[PDB]
Design a protein around this nucleic acid. Structure first.
Ligand code: MG
Ligand code: MG
Ligand code: MG
Ligand code: MG
Ligand code: MG
Ligand code: MG
Ligand code: MG
Ligand code: MG
Ligand code: MG
Ligand code: MG
Ligand code: MG
Ligand code: MG
Ligand code: MG
Ligand code: MG
Ligand code: MG
Ligand code: MG
Ligand code: MG
Ligand code: MG
Ligand code: MG
Ligand code: MG
Ligand code: MG
Ligand code: MG
Ligand code: MG
Ligand code: MG
Ligand code: MG
Ligand code: MG
Ligand code: MG
Ligand code: MG
Ligand code: MG
Ligand code: MG
Ligand code: MG
Ligand code: MG
Ligand code: MG
Ligand code: MG
Ligand code: MG
Ligand code: MG
Ligand code: MG
Ligand code: MG
Ligand code: MG
Ligand code: MG
Ligand code: MG
Ligand code: MG
Ligand code: MG
Ligand code: MG
Ligand code: MG
Ligand code: MG
Ligand code: MG
Ligand code: MG
Ligand code: MG
Ligand code: MG
Ligand code: MG
Ligand code: MG
Ligand code: MG
Ligand code: MG
Ligand code: MG
Lengths: 119, 113, 122, 55, 206
RNA sequence: GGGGAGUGAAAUAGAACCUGAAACCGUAUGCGUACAAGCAGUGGGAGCCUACUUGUUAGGUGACUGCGUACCUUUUGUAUA
RNA sequence: ACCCACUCCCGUUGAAAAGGUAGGGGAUGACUUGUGGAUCGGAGUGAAAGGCUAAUCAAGCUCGGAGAUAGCUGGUUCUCC
RNA sequence: GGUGGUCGGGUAGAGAAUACCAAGGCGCUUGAGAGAACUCGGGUGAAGGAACUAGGCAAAAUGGCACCGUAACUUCGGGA
RNA sequence: UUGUCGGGUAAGUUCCGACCUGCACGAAUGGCGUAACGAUGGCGGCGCUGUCUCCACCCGAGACUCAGUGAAAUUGAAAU
RNA sequence: GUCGGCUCAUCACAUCCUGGGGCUGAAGCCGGUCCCAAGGGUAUGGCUGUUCGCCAUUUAAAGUGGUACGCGAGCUGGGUUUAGAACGUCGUGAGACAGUUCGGUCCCUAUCUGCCGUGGACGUUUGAGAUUUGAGAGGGGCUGCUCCUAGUACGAGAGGACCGGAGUGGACGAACCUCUGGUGUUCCGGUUGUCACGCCAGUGGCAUUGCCGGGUAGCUAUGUUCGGAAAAGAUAACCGCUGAAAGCAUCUAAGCGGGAAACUUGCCUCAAGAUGAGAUCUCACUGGGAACUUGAUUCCCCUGAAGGGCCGUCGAAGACUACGACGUUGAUAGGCUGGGUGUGUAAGCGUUGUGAGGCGUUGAGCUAACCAGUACUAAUUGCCCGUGAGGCUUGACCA
């Protein structure tokens, strides 16, 4: 059973899962609109949205907490210089998951992940 | 769980002093010896604390007559008549299960001051 | 929570030091004996001039267990090891002293003699 | 484990009586009059009126 | 006659003696009689109740007419209770006051669903050897029949399959406390199902 | 890869090319088929459909029902598991 | 390292016509190994298991005698009297 | 799966073991989900501790260096 | 024949010691011992443990579902 | 495909326990034997490949059989029948022994029947949303000990009840997670080696989750709660009442009883595909035209209801399904806010020191699945199915 459990395995180890969603969130902050599978996009919400919430308060400790969770200097800079100020009055929901069709190669359900204010 | 929380909060009227793991406490335990009620003191070190509101518990470990005893007290049970801290421990951990492997001078907890 | 092959310390001065449960009594397919249940033991270790000998098959009552005993408030008392007191055919203690604490579950008409001699009752 | 008797063509086709494909839920955009999957961004790149992918 | 409540979770009650009673809290919102079934009309005696609420968009026109006949609001469901010589009119409120503390009740619920369960969990089958040469058959059922006689598996053979998510009745549970001001029913012990699940509380059959 | 056009006596002679069988796989139409037990036929037999010869007819299907355990071999003997 | 192959499990229409993972033995020697060469079919070679001699061994493979022989098994094809 | 020889950096390390890296080279030619039984390969486990089983099979455990200490027996080397 | 006695276990058709009634030992097809050695056979113990009481939870890989590709043994015919 | 084991069984009754009885060389307690009874229950170890057996220790009891001496396309491989080797023995020998001994490859992806689950289709006569009766079926059914009765009955004493009542257990089963614990590679922390983030500091990768210490939700047993019943009916053996045939006797022939864990119910679950397709409440649809092979016909246009589904957000529901909730008239999921819980006093700065470290800020920082709010994000009034009053015959009311 998985009664009341959260998270998706995605046929990965937890190390690879952690590494992938940190890669995806970094990519999303750089490009502001990415395409991925619908299961990955729905689990990317729980990783990338707490990072924007953290970026609203600019401090040395918050920036270090951001860097531990992204390991990307560019992503940390974008979160506190642009995205943290842009979503200051937005109470969550910084991402938008829009379903596109299916991948040609394997018929995988696709989704668009865009930042809400401007993609 | 708002209904449950309100039922439990009714029976948490007892006032319990703040004690931390590593503290040496004296628990006054209500004992019903046939017809005579009395308080039997259980002194020892708090090695574990489980804060769950009404379902709170703590475990006290004592070395009695050369045999170690561990009692897990239900904090809000009426059996726990009273609680007092003799002295406060200086421990880095929430759980002190490593004390069971130790004895004598090796199982000494530093006082907090 | 003692079963067959489980080794117990001896809480009285009957001369036995170590005993091994060879039967949990009082029921078909009975699995465990808790604090206050009687077991069949064999004496694995003994002192030289004691009342019981090594290899002797006796009845004993469990008085301390690592599994512990639970009170009606939901609390549990656990001991650092498992201990037993050897009994004769009348279900009475063989020794005249009890070592270490016992619990109030022994405060029955059967084992009140163990409780009286115990240094501590918990 | 294998069949003792070759399965008849009637029996083969009876198992396949549950194999028929279903049709997807198709919707029409109003900004463009374009057919798309229901709840999906249109192949042109529109969802509920607005352009989202911008090609 | 019983009531339809929701399992609100498990807690404990401490008596003055110090005893801890494990209780299941059942919130019995007042039940509205939707239809009284008599012998001369339906072949048998029963009372049909509803409880809770349902938004008007999720209530079909047929069900809405059925509720309007009784002049009650739509509930999340509709339930029946077989009756003796009891008399009820549509619109009556069977609240938690038909029970009194200390009395035996039967609680019925849908047990938690475990999905497809193996024989070890579903039927308490013993495991086979984990070592000593057992090949790939550590948790498998073993034999399911005998041989040429009878050359088949008997109906009702204990096999792996779906476990839970079925109607269960726990019998002879003591009522610990009746809280009519909060529509609460505290029964000693456990009742079938998860928190938020519909439970039926009735006077005990035995 | 096709649809036309064209060539040719002929292209369903189009280059995997004369003819183009069977197994096997489809599409269309007619009838039958979701309360019913088995070598799947055979005897009886309603209805429906089609065609003319317009009901003592031909063709297709065949509800329902009696009877009915393939073939070869080898054997005293085989539905034979 | 390299050579080996004691145990379990897996694998057994295998990734593999003998393997893999985890453990295991020898590891300056009667050691392992490359290149080239010698010995072979009632023959060789064998620290000897009837082992090995190209996935073939109580007498290799290939062709010939040869369509060996088979008191044995199987099969034997249109019709009627 | 097998295939002879050569080169073989850094930190730790006795080391060509092992771990993480360098120079270089790769992600192994179906993917995407879901997170049933069961199988395979692992992690942890109350109390008990060989009661398992033909058999402690398997697992668990032990494991390094320096120093102290080390029995019967012995072919005087050992055992160690 | 699980001979008998002794030991070891609560209990020992195995083991160790012994007796001698050797069905049917016996002296280079060697007899009897024997330190060291052995992926050798049997038996006992300490430790250790999911071997077991009695299994629980978790992590990967299958199984399951979707998209692509696409076998096998078997098969007198089946309204099995 | 063999013995034994393991797993899972199913049936018989010639019954081992529990239940009911007759006789007894049955005082009581305990027995013996026979009749009735198959509902449930009916050991763990040592030795041995063993089945068995002996032994130890329990138990109410440790039943006897059939089921390919049940069960290897379910497991094992100890025994037993391959190839190696050895002993005794026999044979000149090759070898052999129904003697011993050490070692020695157990394949198969399930078509049909069957079984356990779970769907799709159609039917149930207009359709639909709910609720339901119960023909029938399945599950369950075990039992100890202590106390009172009562040291009473009985008995020289010793010992020691029936009937009835109360309590507390074992085994088995179900549900549950409040508690006690386990787990918890999605939370926190410690720490070894190394690489990196320019460097310090701080962090991250990798090393079984590197190794560990803890631990939320969930799941879970060893944890918690509950269950077997009572009662009724008809009976078995057995005991009768009345009572003749047969002036007596006689439970039987007529008639009337008592009577068991067996049977039928009572308890629990499933259940109208119960085609015999049942019942109840409520909802919806009240248009034309033509034709042939004239009526339960066909075709054309208008119409498309109740409702269902697709699709989406999901779920303590789940293999896929199905089931359940929600889709802006919205808390369905995620985020956000607050709390809770867990871990255990972050970073940075200041201070003390030569430094490791300490101290203060500081129970700090972080915190999964939990609780409560909150439309910030994602759930588009889009499409499809489903129609237009529901045949005929007979009867009774009715008009
Ligand atoms: Mg969740
Ligand atoms: Mg995958
Ligand atoms: Mg890692
Ligand atoms: Mg579930
Ligand atoms: Mg077992
Ligand atoms: Mg094997
Ligand atoms: Mg195998
Ligand atoms: Mg295995
Ligand atoms: Mg049959
Ligand atoms: Mg022409
Ligand atoms: Mg020609
Ligand atoms: Mg041609
Ligand atoms: Mg029909
Ligand atoms: Mg049939
Ligand atoms: Mg005919
Ligand atoms: Mg017939
Ligand atoms: Mg014959
Ligand atoms: Mg015949
Ligand atoms: Mg045949
Ligand atoms: Mg046949
Ligand atoms: Mg070695
Ligand atoms: Mg030989
Ligand atoms: Mg060869
Ligand atoms: Mg020859
Ligand atoms: Mg010739
Ligand atoms: Mg020939
Ligand atoms: Mg090599
Ligand atoms: Mg290396
Ligand atoms: Mg353990
Ligand atoms: Mg432990
Ligand atoms: Mg031990
Ligand atoms: Mg054993
Ligand atoms: Mg055994
Ligand atoms: Mg081993
Ligand atoms: Mg290991
Ligand atoms: Mg382990
Ligand atoms: Mg002896
Ligand atoms: Mg001997
Ligand atoms: Mg000799
Ligand atoms: Mg001589
Ligand atoms: Mg010799
Ligand atoms: Mg050697
Ligand atoms: Mg496919
Ligand atoms: Mg009988
Ligand atoms: Mg029986
Ligand atoms: Mg009955
Ligand atoms: Mg035995
Ligand atoms: Mg032993
Ligand atoms: Mg058999
Ligand atoms: Mg079989
Ligand atoms: Mg097999
Ligand atoms: Mg640094
Ligand atoms: Mg790296
Ligand atoms: Mg500090
Ligand atoms: Mg019309």
């Amino acid at each position: 059973m998985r009664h009341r459990k959260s998270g998706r395995h995605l046929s990965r180890t937890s190390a690879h899962r952690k590494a992938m969603f940190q890669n995806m969130a970094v990519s999303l902050f750089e490009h502001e609109l990415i395409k991925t599978t619908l299961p990955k996009a729905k689990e990317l919400r729980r990783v990338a949205e707490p990072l924007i919430t953290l970026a609203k308060e600019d401090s040395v400790a918050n920036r270090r907490l951001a860097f531990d969770r992204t390991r990307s200097k560019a992503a940390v800079g974008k979160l506190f210089n642009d995205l943290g100020k842009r979503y200051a009055n937005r109470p969550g929901g910084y991402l938008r998951i829009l379903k596109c069709g299916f991948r040609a190669g394997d018929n995988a359900p696709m989704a668009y992940v865009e930042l809400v204010d401007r993609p | 769980n708002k209904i449950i929380q309100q039922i439990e909060a009714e029976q948490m009227n007892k006032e319990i002093p703040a004690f931390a793991p590593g503290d040496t406490v004296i628990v006054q335990v209500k004992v019903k010896e046939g017809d005579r009620q009395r308080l039997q003191a259980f002194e020892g070190v708090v090695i574990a604390k489980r804060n769950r509101g009404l379902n709170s518990a703590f475990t006290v470990r004592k070395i009695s007559n050369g045999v170690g005893v561990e009692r897990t007290f239900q904090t809000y049970s009426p059996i726990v008549d009273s609680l007092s801290v003799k002295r406060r421990g200086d421990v880095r951990k929430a759980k002190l299960y490593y004390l069971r492997a130790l004895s004598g001078k090796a199982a000494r907890i530093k006082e907090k001051l | 929570m003692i079963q067959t092959q489980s080794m117990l310390d001896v809480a009285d001065n009957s001369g036995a030091r170590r005993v091994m449960c060879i039967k949990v009594l009082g029921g078909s397919h009975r699995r465990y004996a808790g604090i206050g249940d009687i077991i069949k033991v064999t004496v694995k270790e003994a002192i030289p001039r004691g009342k019981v000998k090594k290899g002797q098959v006796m009845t004993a009552v469990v008085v301390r267990t690592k599994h512990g005993v639970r009170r009606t408030d939901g609390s549990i008392i656990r001991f650092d090891g498992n201990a037993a007191v050897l009994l004769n055919n009348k279900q009475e203690p063989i020794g005249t002293r009890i070592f270490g604490p016992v619990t109030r579950e022994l405060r029955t008409e059967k084992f009140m003699k163990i409780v009286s001699l115990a240094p501590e009752v918990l | 484990a294998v069949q003792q008797n070759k399965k008849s063509r009637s029996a083969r086709d009876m198992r396949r009586s549950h194999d028929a494909l279903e049709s997807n839920a198709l919707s029409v955009e109003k900004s463009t009059g374009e057919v798309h999957l229901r709840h999906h961004v249109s192949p042109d790149g529109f969802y509920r009126g607005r352009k989202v992918v911008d090609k | 006659i019983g009531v339809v409540g929701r399992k609100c979770g498990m807690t404990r009650i401490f008596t003055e003696e110090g005893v801890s009673i494990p209780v299941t809290v059942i919130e019995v919102e007042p039940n509205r009689v939707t239809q009284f079934k008599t012998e001369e009309t339906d072949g048998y005696r029963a009372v049909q109740v509803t409880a809770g609420e349902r938004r008007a968009s999720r209530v079909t026109k047929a069900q809405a007419g059925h509720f309007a006949k009784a002049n009650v609001a739509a509930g999340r469901g509709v339930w029946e209770f077989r009756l003796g010589e009891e008399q009820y009119a549509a619109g009556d409120q069977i609240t938690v006051d038909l029970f009194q503390a200390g009395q035996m009740v039967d609680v019925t619920g849908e047990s938690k669903g475990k999905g497809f369960a193996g024989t070890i969990k579903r039927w308490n089958f013993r495991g086979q050897d984990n070592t000593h040469g057992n090949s790939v058959s550590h948790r498998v059922p073993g034999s399911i029949g005998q041989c040429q006689t009878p050359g088949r598996v008997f109906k009702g053979k204990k096999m792996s399959g779906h476990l839970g998510a079925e109607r269960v009745t726990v019998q002879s549970l003591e009522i610990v406390r009746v809280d009519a001001e909060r529509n609460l029913l505290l029964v000693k012990g456990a009742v079938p199902g998860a928190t938020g699940g519909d439970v039926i509380v009735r006077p005990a059959a035995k």
